[PDB]
Amino acid sequence: VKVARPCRKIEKWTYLELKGSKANEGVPQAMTAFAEFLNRTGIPINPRFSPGMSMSVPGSEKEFFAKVKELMSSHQFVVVLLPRKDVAIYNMVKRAADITFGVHTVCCVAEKFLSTKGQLGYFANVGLKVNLKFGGTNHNIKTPIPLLAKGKTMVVGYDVTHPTNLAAGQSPASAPSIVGLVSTIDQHLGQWPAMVWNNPHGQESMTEQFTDKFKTRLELWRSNPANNRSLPENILIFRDGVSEGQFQMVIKDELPLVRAACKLVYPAGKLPRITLIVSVHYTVLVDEIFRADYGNKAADTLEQLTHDMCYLCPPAYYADLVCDRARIHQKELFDALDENDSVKTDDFARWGNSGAVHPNLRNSMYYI
């Protein structure tokens, strides 16, 4: 199955084999079959990989970084083979690659990567991720609902997660939080660049920051050559992570901040229409787009739109993935939270700074 829009050329890549108790065989042949399958699907990865490195996993994370530094720094892409299904090692590799050295990776368990039976299917899944990491689009929704068709609608998803669990029901409003946000940047809806930020005073910090954060997303859209200095005429916004008791807070305290961002960026008198949707299923909280455009067919036009999303709930799922990966990135913070329920607000903020994705990967789907 050919990808809809091929990513950028992947010219210089290699593998990192992390040794387990039994030695692997046939690794270079598997790497060869891997690149062949990706090409067969229309992903322009160089068939030739640079010779890979094999090493056993060191005792500490600092030792690991020192050992992989040159490999990760000198390639655009590394296929990392784990000795077993091990999310502790995965998470360490992601800190090295996503944060410290800034290189795209796929982590594959060696038994799965190397196994001949079922290999084409596994390589297909991995290849879909690679195509996205490097800027492509996988699936083409060819007959979209009018609203997506025109190439004039931006879709947004965000979630807000609380690193401390106090285990006493819902986190209060002041609890420190981390935001993960994604949005589309073009008509194709393949690419969904992410933003992560920290709210050291919880909702108070969200209120101070969301307008300026959202403004950058509009600016990202406008500066994308594809859109030709255009700003979307519609903005569909999905908020995950709230209970029905918190719907009002989203409408009254968060949405106005998005509106203000639009006021700062748009030509005078040229504001976009906005629809806000939450998920506890999904409930439309504010709608300026669908009733306007579709009268009676409103309900059904959005359910088709969100079904098209499945085919090609992405905004909420992608935003969730962004939050989950942020939790891995901000290791200093989570280590600190194991010792006290509260860390200093200045510490919360600067551990956010320390765990930010490397500029090599800044607008990329590193989280996918």
Are 351 and 264 members of one domain? yes
Are 201 and 334 members of one domain? yes
Q: Given 98, 117, 139, which residue is the final one in a domain? A: 139
What's the domain count of the chain? 2
Contact 17, 81 (CB under 8 A): yes
Are 152 and 285 members of one domain? yes
Are 290 and 267 members of one domain? yes
Q: Given 123, 139, 155, which residue is the final one in a domain? A: 139
Q: What is the 3-state secondary structure (H, E, C) of the chain?
A: CCCCECCCCECCEEEEEEECCCCCCCHHHHHHHHHHHHHHCCCCECCCCCCCEEEECCCCHHHHHHHHHHHHHCCCEEEEEECCCCHHHHHHHHHHHHHHHCCEEEEEEHHHHHCCCCHHHHHHHHHHHHHHHCCCECCCCCCCCHHHHCCCEEEEEEEEECCCCCCCCCCCCCCCEEEEEEECCCCCCCCCCEEEEEECCCHHHHHHHHHHHHHHHHHHHHHCHHHCCCCCCEEEEEEECCCHHHHHHHHHHHHHHHHHHHHHHCCCCCCCEEEEEEECCEEEEEECCHHHHHHHHHHHHHHHHHHHHHHCCHHHHHHHHHHHHHHHHCHHHHHHHCCCCCCCHHHHHHHHHHCCCCHHHCCCCCCC
Residues contacting 1, CB < 8 A, separation 6+ = 41, 124
Q: Given 83, 116, 139, which residue is the final one in a domain? A: 139
Q: What is the CATH number of the domain that holds 330?
A: 3.30.420.10
Give dist(CA 220, CA 156) in Å, integer.
13
Are 135 and 152 members of one domain? no
Domain span at residue 26 reads 1-139
Are 199 and 59 members of one domain? no
Q: What is the CATH number of the domain that holds 9?
A: 3.40.50.2300
Are 297 and 163 members of one domain? yes
Technique of determination: X-ray
Are 24 and 51 members of one domain? yes
Are 60 and 193 members of one domain? no
Are 126 and 76 members of one domain? yes
Are 72 and 213 members of one domain? no
Are 190 and 132 members of one domain? no
- Residue holding tokens 């997506």? 148
